[PDB]
Symmetry: C4
Subunit: 394 residues, 4 copies
């Protein structure tokens, strides 16, 4: 076993093909399936896995009642093989966690899970299934992290954390680790900017992140850093906003440097992703400008470097009649593909139950997962598919 280099360029792709769909909520109507959030994906050399957070409650059971806060002592990070339902008997325990990130360095799985009180939380780092290190809250205000795959290159793994207010200036840090030990960290200076729930991927030996601004921006922050934790921080240049909530494209003017907001979009957002394509960018977004419904991905010409409004490709993978949710980025290593570049992939969360479906007492989600390919690929609408309400709701 060797460490994965993962220093290759990201592939240029012309479309995204569906790779998996877990159908977890449909299955959980009768099967024993966890109520979950954030079904993020991470890949090792020979295996991709779906990670997820759960309260340790099953679908159609009384413990799924939404009577416990998100950041509870029951919240755990688990994983299953990509495409599997998040069920009670295939699930692998990863970490205690109400916020998490995970990735694979070529030799072992790394899992970072945050638990504890809001004013004194801490991350426990798990490497090869063993607890190896901890990161304490430095602002004592809900230490939190990506809710998607971290990035490993040359045996070092990297991730982004936030500590501080949800709707005003907070503190943002980048971490470097080796075999589960934190070996370096750096605070990112970003006055007037806000970073949450970063979706990060490797690209030519640097980590590129597209994040969520939960303060003044309906455009997404971009954070790029290297092995020294030297960084560049700003906003996705594109004159097309990709957070939710946002305004219609024609009412938006882009910025590479500043959060662009207002018009009722401040103080919220959703986790999302983007992939640099030379000077251009593939960016995901909900179809609705106001709600977490539908999902589409746009190729914006020169969108990484200027305030372009030129959309050269657009693919819809979930229509606006269906609930979406978080989305995140990951990559497939060279060690399984016949390529000399890293394949960009994303997962899409489709939330069912509360808050949008109030006749249910619970909230869960299922996923679809897509990977970039060298040719154009048609879209469709791969919705969750569960028929609500469920037995427990009656």
């Amino acid at each position: 076993p060797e460490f994965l280099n993962n220093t290759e360029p990201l592939c240029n792709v012309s479309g995204f093909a569906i790779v998996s769909k877990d159908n977890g909520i449909r299955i959980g109507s009768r099967g024993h399936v966890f109520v979950i959030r954030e079904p993020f994906v991470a890949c090792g050399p020979t295996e991709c896995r779906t990670f997820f957070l759960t309260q340790g409650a099953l679908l159609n059971d009384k413990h799924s009642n939404n009577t416990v806060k998100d950041r509870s002592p029951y919240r755990a990070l688990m994983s299953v093989p990509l495409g599997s339902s998040p069920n009670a008997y295939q699930a692998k325990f990863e970490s205690v966690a109400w916020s998490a990130t995970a990735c694979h360095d070529g030799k072992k799985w790394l899992a970072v899970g945050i638990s504890g009180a809001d004013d004194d939380a801490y991350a426990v780092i798990h490497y090869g299934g063993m607890p190896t290190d901890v990161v304490r809250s430095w602002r004592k205000q809900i230490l939190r992290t990506q809710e998607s795959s971290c990035v490993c290159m040359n045996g070092n793994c990297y991730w982004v954390m936030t500590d501080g207010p949800a709707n005003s200036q907070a503190s943002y840090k980048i971490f470097k680790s080796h075999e589960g030990m934190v070996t370096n960290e750096r605070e990112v200076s970003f006055q007037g900017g806000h970073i949450e729930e970063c979706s990060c991927y490797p690209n030519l030996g640097k980590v590129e992140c597209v994040c969520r601004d939960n303060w003044n921006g309906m455009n997404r922050p971009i954070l790029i850093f290297d092995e020294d934790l030297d960084y560049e921080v700003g906003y996705l240049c594109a004159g097309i906003p990709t957070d939710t909530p946002r305004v219609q494209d024609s009412s938006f003017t882009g910025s590479c440097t500043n959060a662009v907001g207002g018009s009722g979009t401040n103080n919220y957002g959703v986790k999302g992703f983007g992939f640099r394509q030379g000077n251009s960018v593939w960016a995901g977004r909900t179809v609705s400008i106001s709600s977490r419904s539908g999902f589409e991905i746009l190729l914006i010409e020169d969108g990484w470097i200027r305030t372009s409004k030129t959309i050269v490709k657009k693919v819809e993978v979930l229509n606006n009649k269906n609930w979406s949710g978080y989305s995140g980025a990951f990559t497939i290593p060279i060690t399984m593909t016949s390529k000399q570049c890293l394949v960009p992939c994303f997962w899409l969360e489709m939330i069912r139950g509360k808050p949008e479906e109030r006749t249910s007492i619970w909230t869960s989600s299922s996923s679809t997962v897509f990977c970039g390919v060298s040719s154009e690929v048609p879209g469709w609408s791969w919705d969750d598919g569960a028929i609500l309400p469920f037995d427990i709701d009656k």
Copy 2:
């Protein structure tokens, strides 16, 4: 790990012995078992697996209600070890798919799954669990494939696809792949012929396929091709028809070149199989000429090369009082047997529920699987065995 040669001659066999029976529907009366179709089998060097399509709904659950079209966004290809029930906790996710084929090249599993809209479907090729390539619909009319094992020889894997009308001239293509990448393709010219749901196997380094004509033929198309995708196409010569629906043997005259139909048999069929035995052929068929009930296999003397009506052996594996369904071919590699030839095997699908059993709201199937042996083997009737209706039907 090395690629499987698979260039040996197909074994001559004198009988078929039962290898497995999954009892999936019986088990699913209480256990957590998917509602499925097409439980096809494919074998690697050391392992055979049952693949299947599911809507992501379990037996005895409301989601099994037949209220969704076959080609849905929920449809997925999964697999379990041969003989296992298609259950929620042993199942391995293979591909999003409402049509599929899968096989093993000696090193890794290949899975080809088609999804998307009828007018713009696409196959996603999965190799070693990673998405590697795509094949787009070229006629924009329900791109579709074998619903049984593909064939790998010398590290190349091959399969047959169809695109176009169900009941008139369509378009048929053969594909060649290496490590999940399409490396060659060829359109098969077959004017007046119709090819669906090919059952293919390796024989002396060529791929031999016995298919379904859903147009003018109650005889089965035969397609034989080599590594260059050079091909021969026609019909099973035998003066014994083996599709369903068909007419009684005495009312049928065979043809090597032309579809033979009429007499109320046009515009339908069922997936089935045959195995060349030198100049002769083993061919499966339902016992009933009109319905998918019962199953028997016939050895027809010189049936591969002339319009013979000489049946030298016949074995029944399911009596006509019981529902059958699709059947398909596969082979067992040399790397597990003590033979210098490839062992011919078939699977039999036994459909329960709709359309034949209208007091049930669902449709599923279970399987029996048989392999050829060097001596004669008695038949019997190994039926599905589930007691309908089920709880959910009341």
Copy 3:
């Protein structure tokens, strides 16, 4: 991987220690557990497994209703790790079978499963999970076999089969196989004797079997054979009868050569076992002389060579207030123990439901398993423990 020699002498043991108890029926009150019979055990170099026959029906499900004959098309042989419940999600499919034997040769698992009609049954031999050979019924009268572990030595595996009447002279054969291919067979001449359900084990390079006489004997047949299938056949010499039904010890006179019966004991029996200990013998039996209740094992001084009534040790592992059933022999290879001899072990089946418990609609069994050790070990009563009737019975 290499073939297991298994030519060592059987260990002399002074007691039997409990190794496992599956609690399958207790678990199956709520869990998804097969209704089973004959939970026999077989061991490879690094692993012991419990094999079992099932109708493919689960406990507490309607399909467990005793409305199907034992020799049905649904009957299958499966296995789980030793000590595991025979459940729907850990079970490994082995063979279609209403009668079976299985063992491990050091490299792969061998499973022999009989199915088909009573007048034309056949065994399918599975090796490493692949069908390799068949054995046809030669008397056309319920071909049947051990219902316990077969024996492998030096890469050859051996088992005993019977074909013919249940309660009069039948035909008995020994089989030799290599890598799943039958390489030799021999009919055992035993006029006036009856052999069923042999419990066999290796001892100094020969196979020693203790069987069931279902005709005129309340004493157990002994069959000993070598690699050439040369054999000795007779009855356990001991003046202590060990079949059920039988008479009280004081009413019995032993014989090395002849079936001893009468007194209402003819035409029935139960599968059981014994282990040669030099000139002596460990023999199991039900505590009751008439019913399958309780279980004890007796060390009979010189019981292998003369009509001894000297019982030097006796251990009870199930009291007479509890239902027993079949019992069988197996051995643990040197490759896991620190011994130069083969450790003798037995499994005990504890039957619940019909016929003894008529308020239940089903019949299943669970197991306890014991291995011989160099010192005396106290007994106890490890009963099945399920509380009947079950939900489905109401």
Copy 4:
């Protein structure tokens, strides 16, 4: 594969970080999860597992009714990966057992399980899944052992057993084994002392144990021994009592040599643990002095060598409003960490149902697990979380 040295010094740690939480009872509201006690943890070179005792009954099933004594013929030791629920389909059978210990020597798992009658119990030693040896009761009075991990060093594994009265002078023995064979034993002379349920760990090539006195001591016995089974025995010196029941700290005077009790604390206790830290000690205890509620761990300055009352650190991991239970020690080997010392960890059992919650008919527990780290870590309260009563209780 090689034997684990495990002769390194125990790490000095400044805090304990949460590693896992199984949420078993919450999951078992709907999933198939055993009713358990003593979810102890043991680690091999590459894997930690949760072991547990069960009656072979599932949560929410009638067999979970508390109508069977603890020491029953149904009681079994099983294991799952650390963090997994003790469920019916992931569980691995380890031993028949109503008392147990288990550990890993670097090559294989060792499991020691005691069963049989109170007046003639015996331990069966399982090594690599094979029965290898037995230990008989020597006082014929409920032979019993640690209910936590044993200790392996240089290929030898060690554990402590007790035989005799629960509330007066009993007999205590230390055992040494190699590959599942008992190779040495020693009776520990401890007149006026009482040893039960030892929590043991390796430290610089010796075994250090912190136990439970169920007689005259509210302080915990300490037993330290080496490879020769030479030993030192006494009591934890600290002037802080850590058993339950106990008196308030200010009412307690420590002793290194004598049991300190009275004041209504005699004749009971709870399994607990401590870790030597040079001259100091980390010791766990319930928050309540009288009941098994809450849990905290204290670093007592010089607490290993003198009657110190100086508490330098205290961390609470479960508040006093929540039920606790047994706790035990284990260590993480060097072969997974980047350390030159053995990491001290503990598990905490949280009991639900009887006796404290009398509206339930059953008793089970779930666990949280913590490992020592080089920095201080905040506490919190990670409670079981199940909502009682359950369906079966109505």
